């Protein structure tokens, strides 16, 4: 679908309704509980969500840019070509990046759908490429974008984001970019739908400084000691003076929402039988998040530099971090502009300002609890709450909540609304959840616990029920990879829901947070160790030990395969003893290859996309042993990505990346 129209309020105009919007959304939330709290027997409908970047290959000039000129694709697919999509069970939606596409099946998968996830993904991609070939035919007749070739790629990060000639607009600095005020990103990187520039601007005003994300640079023999792309400018005060103060030697400096929300991910949403099972499943998935982030790593480069990290998470986390220096317990970089460190927080509410340990884009803060294995002591970290909100969810006449659930929402409500339309200030709280969604939707976490709407009363069997979103996966290039990882989490979820009486997955939150940091290290999948539960089938107990990703996938006692994957496959009747017997199955062979791909990457036998990309840059004939990705290296890298995406092994690249056996398999067997 397309995003709804309206007049967004800029920060100074909107902050005055902060409390109003929180209040009314809490009431909307209570009506949701009142109406849908007792749903039961909801089927396991689920679905994935992919994001694409449209890349413009200028082959004559050996430059591949982000394509910011074909964004109409999203309106046409939702308008005169919607029937194409519907007939094909796909649906397209806007994302932060003007060059991005997001797409989902049009109807949820129901239980195990085998190769269909992959089939459906391929249809999404086929239709995007179809639209792009259409434009290429028009552009030709109108003599436009000559020499250009546009391809949607499922990249996590565009390696040259914010670097010279990275977008296909000739001279984008011939005007100012007043939304981000970035040194590197023209606001053309932002989707045209007013919501996105409004959010960019609001967060930067509220913060009173630009978002700042310093990523450790890979330190090769000739790597500069500072990010030599930083420059002085005089368009914007204070923002043009922040880089000198905010950057750090040995770190890539980024200063714009686009560097993070302009990155892509794979996300998968699951419907649980009821709220209680949804709380159980959410909690059980908490420590899978950092493990899967490390596992699926696909981001080893930012803003033209090789990084000493392999995932995007911390960059997106900083990219929307609306915390004032006061909330961050640090001084403003420029006290003359950022008055007292309170950024754009209204004076008359500065006395309510809390110190907040984490960005509103950050890993789950709290177990929801409410299940037999839960104990509140597992919530052992610093998690500020909105007491007023806690009070009201505890004591109200519509749906009084248990303390642990109330605490979850109360933490979500420490944040201000950062994107609000005028037309919406007043709602019918009985039927609308827009105010709740204001806050729900701008707490971006490794998982998301998703209430239905007020309309979703137990009698309505097809309404979405209580759902859990799994949000940490990096997006991979091939639809076979993304389907592999979507089916992985599906089997894990079905396993958790099927064996809910016997699986205790609780561990201390502090350990999860620690895992989230470890998950970023370069080559973490290959050697790092992570806190992981010693056993899952054990009352009361919450002992962890430190296990490699390979042990975490394969250990008989606590491994993903022996404790989640194989047991659900046995019980569904796909195997008797072991997932590997799928190799010889007539109906389940592709599933064998999905799981083999997963097993071989978890054990280090096959590279992550991040490792493949990094090898590529390091072995490139034009590489200058200084961590820099040049237009030339970027071009060739993305050309390889294009061939990989299309299973083109003419240069042996697919064999090099998937290994021969998998490569031969996918080259010779379509999903069906």
Ligand X SMILES: N[C@@H](CCC(=O)O)C(=O)O
The piece of 257-265, 369-377, 400-408, 542-550 that touches ligand X (CB under 6 A) is: 257-265
Residue whose CB is less far from ligand X, 445 or 495: 445
Residue whose CB is less far from ligand X, 93 or 241: 93
Q: How many whole angstroms separate alpha carbon 159 and alpha carbon 640?
A: 13
Q: By CB under 6 A, tell whether 401 contacts ligand X.
A: no
The SS3 assignment for 52 reads strand
Q: By CB under 6 A, tell whether 479 contacts ligand X.
A: no
* Least Cβ distance, residue 263 to ligand X (angstroms): 5
* Least Cβ distance, residue 367 to Mg ion (angstroms): 25
Using CB distances below 5 to 8 A depending on partner kind, what does residue 58 bind out of ligand X, Mg ion, none? none
Nearest to 646 by CA among 174, 125, 207, 217: 125
* Residue choice 14, 180, 202, 264 for contact with ligand X (CB under 6 A): 264
Q: How many whole angstroms separate alpha carbon 275 and alpha carbon 255?
A: 40
- Dihedral angle sign, alpha carbons of residues 256, 178, 151, 102: positive
* Least Cβ distance, residue 312 to ligand X (angstroms): 6
Which tokens go with 540?
A: 């009361």
Using CB distances below 5 to 8 A depending on partner kind, what does residue 649 bind out of Mg ion, ligand X, none? none
Residue whose CB is less far from ligand X, 18 or 156: 156
Query: Which residue of this chain has its Cβ atom nearest to Mg ion in the complex?
Result: 102
* Least Cβ distance, residue 313 to ligand X (angstroms): 8
**How buried is 587 (Cβ within 10 angstroms: 0-12 exposed, 13-18 middle, 19+ buried)?**
exposed
* Least Cβ distance, residue 264 to Mg ion (angstroms): 8
Using CB distances below 5 to 8 A depending on partner kind, what does residue 550 bind out of Mg ion, ligand X, none? none
* Residue choice 55, 211, 299, 316 for contact with ligand X (CB under 6 A): 316
Per the CB < 8 A criterion, the answer to whether 230 and 244 are in contact is: yes
Give the x/- contact pattern for ligand X in 43-82, rule: CB under 6 A. --------x-------------------------------
Per the CB < 8 A criterion, the answer to whether 264 and 154 are in contact is: yes
* Least Cβ distance, residue 316 to ligand X (angstroms): 6
How large is the angle between the packed helices 479-498 and 275-285, nearest 10 degrees? Answer: 120
Q: By CB under 6 A, tell whether 356 contacts ligand X.
A: no
The piece of 33-41, 244-252, 261-269, 563-571 that touches ligand X (CB under 6 A) is: 261-269
First to last CA, the chain: 27
* Residue 636 CA, distance from chain mean position: 26
Q: By CB under 6 A, tell whether 128 contacts ligand X.
A: no
Residue whose CB is less far from ligand X, 262 or 559: 262
Q: How many helices (H) and strands (E) would you count in the chain? A: 24, 15
Residue whose CB is less far from ligand X, 115 or 440: 440
Which tokens go with 614?
A: 């990094």
For residue 469, how many other CB atoms are within 10 A of its CB?
18
Residues in the interface with ligand X (CB under 6 A) total 8
Which DSSP state fits 72? Answer: T
- Dihedral angle sign, alpha carbons of residues 177, 254, 92, 322: negative
* Least Cβ distance, residue 444 to ligand X (angstroms): 6
Give the x/- contact pattern for ligand X in 426-465, rule: CB under 6 A. ------------------x---------------------
Q: Which of residues 85-124 bind Mg ion (CB under 5 A)?
A: 102
Residue whose CB is less far from ligand X, 390 or 475: 475
Residue whose CB is less far from ligand X, 270 or 564: 270
Q: By CB under 6 A, tell whether 116 contacts ligand X.
A: no
Q: How many whole angstroms separate alpha carbon 532 and alpha carbon 522?
A: 20
- Facing residues of 444 across strands? 361
* Residue choice 103, 263, 278, 285 for contact with ligand X (CB under 6 A): 263
Per the CB < 8 A criterion, the answer to whether 118 and 671 are in contact is: yes
Which DSSP state fits 348? Answer: G
- Dihedral angle sign, alpha carbons of residues 486, 488, 490, 492: negative
* Residue 502 CA, distance from chain mean position: 30
Give the x/- contact pattern for Mg ion in 177-206, rule: CB under 5 A. ------------------------------
Using CB distances below 5 to 8 A depending on partner kind, what does residue 263 bind out of ligand X, Mg ion, none? ligand X
Which DSSP state fits 292? Answer: H
CA geometry: angle 503, 508, 509, nearest 5 deg: 110
Residues in the interface with Mg ion (CB under 5 A) total 1
Q: By CB under 6 A, tell whether 337 contacts ligand X.
A: no
Q: Which of residues 164-193 bind ligand X (CB under 6 A)?
A: none
Q: By CB under 6 A, tell whether 368 contacts ligand X.
A: no
Q: How many whole angstroms separate alpha carbon 569 and alpha carbon 563?
A: 11
* Residue choice 29, 265, 641, 654 for contact with ligand X (CB under 6 A): 265
Residue whose CB is less far from ligand X, 36 or 157: 157
Which tokens go with 305?
A: 């530099």
Query: Which residue of this chain has its Cβ atom nearest to ligand X in the complex?
Result: 265
What string of H, E and C letters represents the secondary structure of 188-231?
Answer: HHECCCCHHHHHHHHHHHHHCCCCCEEEEECCCCCCCCCCCCCC
Residues at the interface with ligand X (CB under 6 A): 51, 261, 263-265, 312, 316, 444
Residues at the interface with Mg ion (CB under 5 A): 102
């Amino acid at each position: 679908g397309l995003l709804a129209l309206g007049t967004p309020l800029q920060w100074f105009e909107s902050r005055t309704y902060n409390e109003h919007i929180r209040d009314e959304g809490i009431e909307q939330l209570l009506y949701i509980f009142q109406a849908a709290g007792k749903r039961d027997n909801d089927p396991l409908f689920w679905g994935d969500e992919l994001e694409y970047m449209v890349v413009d290959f200028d082959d004559k000039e050996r430059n591949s840019m982000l394509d910011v000129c074909h964004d109409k694709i999203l309106t046409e697919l939702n308008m005169e070509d919607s029937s194409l999509c519907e007939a094909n069970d796909v649906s397209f939606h806007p994302e932060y990046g003007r060059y991005m596409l997001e797409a989902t099946p049009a109807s949820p998968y129901l239980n195990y759908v085998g190769s269909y996830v992959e089939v459906n993904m391929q249809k999404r991609r086929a239709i995007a490429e179809y639209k792009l070939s259409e434009y290429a035919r028009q552009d030709s007749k109108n003599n436009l974008h000559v020499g250009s070739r546009s391809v949607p790629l499922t990249l996590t990060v565009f390696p040259r984001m914010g670097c010279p000639d990275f977008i296909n607009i000739k001279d984008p600095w011939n005007h100012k970019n007043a939304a981000s005020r970035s040194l590197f990103l023209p606001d053309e990187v932002i989707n045209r739908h007013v919501r996105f520039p409004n959010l960019t601007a609001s967060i930067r005003t509220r913060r009173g400084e630009k978002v700042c994300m310093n990523v450790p640079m890979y330190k090769d023999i000739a790597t500069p000691e500072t990010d030599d792309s930083i420059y002085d400018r005089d368009w914007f005060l204070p923002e043009d003076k922040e880089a000198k103060l905010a950057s750090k030697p040995g770190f890539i400096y980024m200063d714009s929402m686009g560097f993070g929300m302009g990155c892509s991910c794979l996300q998968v949403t699951f419907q649980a039988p009821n709220i209680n099972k949804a709380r159980y499943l959410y909690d059980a998935l908490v420590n899978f998040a950092p493990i899967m982030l490390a596992f699926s790593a696909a981001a080893p480069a930012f803003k033209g530099w090789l990084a000493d990290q392999d995932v995007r998470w911390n960059v997106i986390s900083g990219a929307v971090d609306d915390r004032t220096p006061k909330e961050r317990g640090v001084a403003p970089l420029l006290p003359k502009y950022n008055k007292n460190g309170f950024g754009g927080i209204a004076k008359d509410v500065q006395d309510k300002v809390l110190e907040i340990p984490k960005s509103r884009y950050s890993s789950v803060d709290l177990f929801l609890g409410g299940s037999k294995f839960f104990n509140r002591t597992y919530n052992d970290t610093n998690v500020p709450i909105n007491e007023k909100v806690l009070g009201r969810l505890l004591e109200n006449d519509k749906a009084p909540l248990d303390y642990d659930l109330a605490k979850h929402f109360a933490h979500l409500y420490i944040r201000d609304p950062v994107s609000t339309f005028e037309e919406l200030l007043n709602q019918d709280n009985k039927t609308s959840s827009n105010h709740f969604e204001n806050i729900q939707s701008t707490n971006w976490q490794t998982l998301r616990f998703k209430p239905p709407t007020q309309q979703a009363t137990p009698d309505k069997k097809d309404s979405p029920g209580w759902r859990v979103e799994f949000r940490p996966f990096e997006v991979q290039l091939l639809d076979f990879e993304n389907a592999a990882y979507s089916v992985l989490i599906y089997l894990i979820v079905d396993s958790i829901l099927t064996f809910s009486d016997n699986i205790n997955a609780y561990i201390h939150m502090s350990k999860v947070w620690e895992n989230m940091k470890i998950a970023h290290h370069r080559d973490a999948i290959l050697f790092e160790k992570f806190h992981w539960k010693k056993s899952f089938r054990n009352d009361t107990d919450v002992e962890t030990e430190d296990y490699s990703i390979s042990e975490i996938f394969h250990n008989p006692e606590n491994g993903i395969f022996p404790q989640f994957v194989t047991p659900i496959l046995c019980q569904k009747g796909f195997v008797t003893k072991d997932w590997k017997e799928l190799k010889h199955s007539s109906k389940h062979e592709r599933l064998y290859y999905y799981l083999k791909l997963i097993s071989d990457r978890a054990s280090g036998e096959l590279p992550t996309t991040a490792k493949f990309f990094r090898n590529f840059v390091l072995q490139h004939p034009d590489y200058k042993h200084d961590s820099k990705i040049s237009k030339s290296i970027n071009y060739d890298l993305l050309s390889t990505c294009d061939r990989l995406t299309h299973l083109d092994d003419s240069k042996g690249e697919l064999t090099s990346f998937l290994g021969a056996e998998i490569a031969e398999y996918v080259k010779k067997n379509k999903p069906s």
